Design an enzyme around this catalytic site. Structure first.
Site, mmCIF file in Angstrom:
data_model
loop_
_atom_site.group_PDB
_atom_site.id
_atom_site.type_symbol
_atom_site.label_atom_id
_atom_site.label_comp_id
_atom_site.label_asym_id
_atom_site.label_seq_id
_atom_site.Cartn_x
_atom_site.Cartn_y
_atom_site.Cartn_z
ATOM 1 N N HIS A 164 4.103 8.263 -8.241
ATOM 2 C CA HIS A 164 2.872 7.566 -7.776
ATOM 3 C C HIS A 164 1.857 7.719 -8.887
ATOM 4 O O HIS A 164 1.562 8.854 -9.301
ATOM 5 C CB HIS A 164 2.314 8.184 -6.483
ATOM 6 C CG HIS A 164 3.280 8.185 -5.326
ATOM 7 N ND1 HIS A 164 3.907 9.339 -4.892
ATOM 8 C CD2 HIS A 164 3.659 7.205 -4.464
ATOM 9 C CE1 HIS A 164 4.645 9.061 -3.823
ATOM 10 N NE2 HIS A 164 4.477 7.788 -3.518
ATOM 11 N N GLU A 170 -3.021 5.610 -7.684
ATOM 12 C CA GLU A 170 -3.083 4.990 -6.363
ATOM 13 C C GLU A 170 -4.525 4.829 -5.877
ATOM 14 O O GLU A 170 -4.815 3.889 -5.142
ATOM 15 C CB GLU A 170 -2.283 5.823 -5.375
ATOM 16 C CG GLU A 170 -2.206 5.242 -3.942
ATOM 17 C CD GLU A 170 -1.310 6.028 -3.003
ATOM 18 O OE1 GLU A 170 -0.728 7.073 -3.425
ATOM 19 O OE2 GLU A 170 -1.129 5.555 -1.860
ATOM 20 N N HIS A 192 8.967 5.897 2.364
ATOM 21 C CA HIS A 192 9.062 7.316 2.758
ATOM 22 C C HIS A 192 9.675 7.392 4.142
ATOM 23 O O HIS A 192 8.972 7.386 5.141
ATOM 24 C CB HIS A 192 7.685 7.988 2.778
ATOM 25 C CG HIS A 192 7.007 8.007 1.435
ATOM 26 N ND1 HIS A 192 6.932 9.139 0.655
ATOM 27 C CD2 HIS A 192 6.384 7.027 0.733
ATOM 28 C CE1 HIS A 192 6.263 8.872 -0.457
ATOM 29 N NE2 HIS A 192 5.922 7.592 -0.437
HETATM 30 FE FE LIG Z 1 4.771 6.525 -1.772
#
Ligand SMILES: [Fe+3]
Ligand SMILES: [Fe+3]
Ligand SMILES: [K+]
Ligand SMILES: [K+]
Lengths: 409, 409
Positions: free
Chosen positions: A206, A209, A63
């Site tokens: 994602h 997670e 990111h």
């Molecule tokens: Fe990420």
């Protein structure tokens, strides 16, 4: 045309000694120097007998827009971390100006990474990625769990997708990201994935997670419940997990993190054209535990760093050292070999770039690094590369020596 | 007399802001700058508001004589590693001359360690340790499982012990080490420990470093059996574990590694004046797993690096990062605090030196390091110190600024 004769080549799957590599934009031949000069009389031979040649790394998940973070976001616990992103992104984003982004991408190349998957939430990183010498898959991420504002979120995503698509070239590919199964309404996810289908884009998501995500999507309870009630005024998950996962069946998808995935999800993803992206430092620092590699053995995985929003560096050598330590019971010499393969070949396969292997016909995306001293067992090389290396001496992208120092395409 | 006003002091147990430290050889006072200058009008105030003050580390367990090793010894598996030590020590020892030892000890100070426990097998490191500015406990190690040669092994140990004892001073203490319960005959261990008792020496012993040791000492079987039959022509363990452990009951002992210790051993050691020394990188790289900290909670532990014979650096910041990762399910912000305390105060307690705490009356053994940028939660400081620090800006031993650069007492 150039010929490099190192002490050894990590292909990455094999260790080759007594051969050199002839390359221009692509790797043209791998053979003894004597044979190579017969074929390539115009290529000067460079002898680097105290060095190793291996592919450039792929780092398929970072990111960039959060590259100003050092100690601002809350580590240790995922929901508090997420609250801190919401609280501080208005401060952190402007701090990472063009100089911050340029310096970050340059640092990535200087540490031996030659291809990246950039997750972009606001498009603030577009100019830096198109300028960079790195190969970039530029994932335009969509987010929004409220149906009422899905049109606005889709419009933003669509504009960013098209703003990126005009710049496509051998080192820049426009792609699509779905933030997660808890934060993107099914209809918004579906519409974004229809764009990926239309344009033949890679997709990233994602997935599982955190334990909070696992419990929220299974039961509508747990740590996410307070977050959804307070921030979103939502009392139950917007998506059925199985329905959401089905949206990805016809796409090439990077499923990122996967720490808390269950057996049914893993079986489903194994049947897809899909890779898992393992981010060991980020998972550990955010109190999310460690991906069980044995449980996902049916799915290829690659290694990534995530952003500086949940990591202290973007150096893949550091990520690989951490990977050795968070899987501490995996025999080190063999696991280091697995890691080097996953960080090069597998990450390049995940990003769809031609590279990640020292093999004829591949782009010459390569690193030249110091040979660890006193080696007695050549099979130990992968482990000693991870332990003793912090940065390469030279880095090639499509045969161009960027680290010698040019950071721009 | 000097006053330093940092952004914060890690004591290590507490975070103090808005106070400074007055020190000469010892820490004399901790108070506001305004109060300190009233008491110490001759002390210039140094403002370091972008820095943190914490104690120097103790590294209570390292093998300096093996500091030439980079990739020569066999990692991944303990018995193969041990075979490689036997095979290569004749090559590695001479490679580490005075320059190698001087450079190694200087590197230790430059990375913020101010006290060490040096395990010495041959006495080749004596001159370097007496010359060094570091506080050193110099453990003269004895080894030998064959009764027939115990007299010779004892003679060597005794000569080395007395050669070291003549140099004792505030920064050098002569001590005794027992290599392990598998490699030292009971009578040889007893005689060496009688010397420790006579002179009031600290003692160190490697205990339950490997599963091979566990199985050999419990059953006389497993991976060590081939080693003992081939190298030593021994068919069963020379020591009864309980009898061997009893030898340490009246001594202050550092029990090193302890990964494979059982509940009875732990209960016994808890009743002794004893510390555990946790060496996470060494244990992981030699295929020995990870010490379960919950099982040894009744015994204080400290952190050490072991030698470069089973580690890629002697930098305690690197050891602490690895410790975070090999215990990946320990919540990071609290565990980083625990680690910093164990690396300073606990290691100093283990070595019996007056230090390891920023507290009045302690020697001024201190590190000044960069403050991590953008901190939002002061409680996160311990974690960010481990993640973002590689070396201190300044290092003090007994108030003397050695890293400013003087490496010698
Ligand atoms: Fe990420
Ligand atoms: Fe040791
Ligand atoms: K690019
Ligand atoms: K000394």
């Amino acid at each position: 045309m150039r010929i490099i004769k190192p002490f050894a080549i990590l292909t990455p799957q094999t260790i080759i000694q007594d051969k050199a590599v002839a390359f221009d934009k692509k790797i043209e031949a791998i053979d003894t120097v004597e044979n190579l000069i017969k074929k390539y009389p115009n290529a000067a031979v460079e002898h680097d007998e105290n060095s190793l040649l291996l592919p450039g790394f792929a780092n398929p998940h970072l990111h960039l827009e959060f590259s100003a973070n050092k100690a601002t976001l809350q580590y240790g616990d995922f929901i508090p971390w997420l609250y801190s992103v919401i609280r501080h992104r208005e401060d952190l984003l402007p701090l990472c100006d063009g100089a911050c982004l340029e310096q970050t991408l340059s640092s990535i190349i200087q540490t031996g990474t030659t291809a990246i998957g950039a997750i972009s939430s606001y498009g603030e990183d577009l100019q830096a990625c198109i300028d960079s010498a790195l190969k970039v898959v530029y994932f335009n991420e969509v987010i929004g769990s409220n149906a009422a504002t899905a049109d606005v979120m889709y419009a933003s995503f669509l504009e960013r997708f098209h703003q990126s698509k005009k710049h496509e070239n051998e080192r820049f590919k426009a792609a699509v990201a779905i933030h997660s199964p808890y934060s993107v309404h099914y209809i918004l996810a579906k519409r974004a994935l229809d764009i990926a289908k239309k344009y033949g884009s890679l997709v990233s998501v994602h997935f599982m997670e955190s334990r909070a995500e696992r419990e929220w999507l299974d039961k509508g309870s747990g740590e996410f419940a307070k977050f959804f009630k307070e921030f979103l005024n939502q009392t139950r998950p917007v998506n059925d997990t199985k329905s959401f996962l089905e949206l990805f069946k016809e796409l090439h998808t990077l499923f990122v993190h996967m720490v808390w995935a269950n057996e049914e999800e893993i079986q489903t993803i194994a049947s897809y054209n899909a890779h898992i992206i393992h981010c060991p430092i980020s998972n550990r620092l955010l109190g999310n535990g460690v991906l069980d590699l044995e449980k996902i053995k049916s799915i290829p995985y690659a290694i990534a760093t995530d952003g500086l929003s949940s990591n202290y560096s973007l150096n893949m050598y550091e990520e690989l050292k951490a990977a050795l330590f968070v899987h501490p019971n995996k025999e080190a010499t063999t696991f280091a070999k697995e890691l080097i393969i996953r960080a090069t070949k597998a990450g390049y396969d995940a990003l769809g770039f031609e590279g990640g292997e020292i093999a004829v016909g591949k782009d010459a995306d390569m690193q030249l690094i110091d040979l660890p001293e006193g080696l007695t067992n050549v099979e130990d090389l992968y482990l000693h590369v991870i332990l003793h290396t912090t940065k390469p001496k030279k880095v090639y992208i499509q045969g161009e020596e960027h680290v010698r120092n040019l950071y721009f395409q």
